[PDB]
């Protein structure tokens, strides 16, 4: 809106602004390595208890090697969001006299 004035100045019309904004994409990738022997003997059943101890060690290994990837993905989330905040952050001395 505008405010009328008694002066001879010509009137500014009704003013309309249209602003367009779009998404920005982010891709996040982790790599994990799994040994042959663990993934093989996971399918193998325990015949004797020392093979059962190797089995439980195997499933502990693969469980930790999966938690590593998922936790690193959460760190990817927080790293990308903090980077997006820092990409649109002008410094103080520029912004203060613009305020």
């Amino acid at each position: 809106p505008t405010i009328a004035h008694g002066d001879g100045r010509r009137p500014s019309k009704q003013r309309t602004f249209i602003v367009v904004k779009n998404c920005h994409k982010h891709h996040i990738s982790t790599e994990m390595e799994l040994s042959m022997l663990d993934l093989e003997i996971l399918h193998s059943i325990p015949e004797t208890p020392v093979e059962y101890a190797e089995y439980v060690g195997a499933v502990k290994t693969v469980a930790s090697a999966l938690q590593f990837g998922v936790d690193a993905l959460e760190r990817g989330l927080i790293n990308t969001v903090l980077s997006v905040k820092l990409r649109h952050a002008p410094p103080m001395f520029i912004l203060q006299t613009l305020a």
């Binding site: 799994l34 040994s35 993934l39 399918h43």
Partner: protein
């Protein structure tokens, strides 16, 4: 009108249900579940090993229609590939016990040399240190500790003094690969090696198998030369070099590619080419040939070279170790 000469309708559903499913990929993970049997479908590498009992073999799936063992009976066999997995081809050799030193690092590459006699039943093979003794760090000392009486090697090659002159010693040797199993007998040792595929232990207590090279023979081609590309596979090469001291045997690793590798071979051996070509030896028609190159196979790039000590009879030698090697022998190419 319902003649139905084709047997397709209501039968072929049952066959397409078996012949259809692809091996799984791109399965999604939810943090709430975080660990399910559906994950374990992809996690399992689905091994091939024996419990020596009939029902357990039916369970494990060694009695598979394909090359690679598939458990599941009729429910098994739908894998339709395993990223192009290949079973390893095994080579069976029968050697005199004097040519082959009984203590061995289980991963050293072997080389077969042919013998002249017709309709034989036995053949020779070699290790690189046997080759160094026959050609004539602490490499020589370690070789002298591993081997005594070179005469027992010298009878196996009755042409060596002539072969090093007629420059034909390289093409008789065909590279084979690392060991898998050794069986000790006093008269005749039983040796089993691996060719063309994964280097895999057949020993039922499972172990990770690595090819080992003596560090004096090996020179890293990538090291002394110079966002470059890195392809996932580098290759290993043998080079057998005719020098005035004698024939010499070396190993090279690079990921560069063949026409590059020939140039880096040439600028590597340029001082030796200068010396051997020098004045000691003028010329003769057979003498022109100088070196031979063969590829031993692809190795995982960025893994690198694992340096370890080799201890025998109270002596140590520095040895490089190579993980996850893939075997693929090529022919011999002449370099000069």
């Amino acid at each position: 009108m319902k003649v139905q000469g084709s047997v397709d309708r209501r039968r072929l559903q049952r066959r397409i249900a078996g012949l259809l499913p692809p091996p799984a990929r791109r399965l999604n993970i939810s943090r709430g579940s975080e660990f399910t049997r559906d994950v374990r479908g992809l996690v399992e590498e689905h091994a091939q090993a024996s419990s020596l009992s009939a029902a357990a073999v039916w369970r494990a799936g060694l009695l598979a229609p394909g090359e690679v063992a598939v458990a599941g009976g009729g429910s098994g066999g739908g894998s339709f590939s395993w990223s192009g997995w290949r079973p390893p081809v095994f080579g069976d050799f029968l050697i005199h016990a004097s040519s082959f030193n009984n203590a061995e690092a289980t991963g050293t590459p072997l080389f077969q040399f042919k013998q002249s006699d017709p309709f034989s039943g036995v053949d020779a093979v070699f290790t690189p240190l046997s080759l160094f003794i026959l050609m004539n760090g602490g490499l020589t000392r370690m070789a002298n500790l591993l081997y005594d009486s070179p005469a027992t090697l010298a009878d196996l090659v009755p042409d060596f003094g002539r072969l090093v002159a007629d420059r034909r010693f390289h093409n008789f040797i065909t590279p084979v690969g690392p060991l898998v199993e050794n069986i000790k007998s006093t008269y005749l040792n039983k040796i089993t090696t691996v060719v063309h595929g994964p280097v895999v232990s057949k020993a039922i207590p499972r172990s990770t198998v690595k090819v080992t090279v003596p560090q004096e023979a090996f020179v890293d081609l990538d090291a002394w030369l110079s966002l470059q590309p890195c392809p996932a596979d580098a290759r290993l090469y043998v080079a057998l070099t005719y020098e005035e001291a004698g024939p010499r045997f070396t190993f090279f690793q690079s990921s560069r590619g063949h026409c590059q590798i020939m140039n880096i071979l040439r600028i590597y051996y340029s001082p030796s080419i200068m010396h051997r070509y020098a004045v000691v030896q003028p010329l003769h028609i057979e003498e022109l040939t100088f070196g031979a190159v063969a590829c031993l196979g692809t190795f995982s790039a960025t893994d690198g070279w694992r340096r370890s000590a080799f201890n025998y009879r109270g002596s140590s030698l520095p040895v490089v170790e190579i993980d996850s090697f893939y075997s693929n022998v090529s022919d011999w190419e002449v370099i000069l």
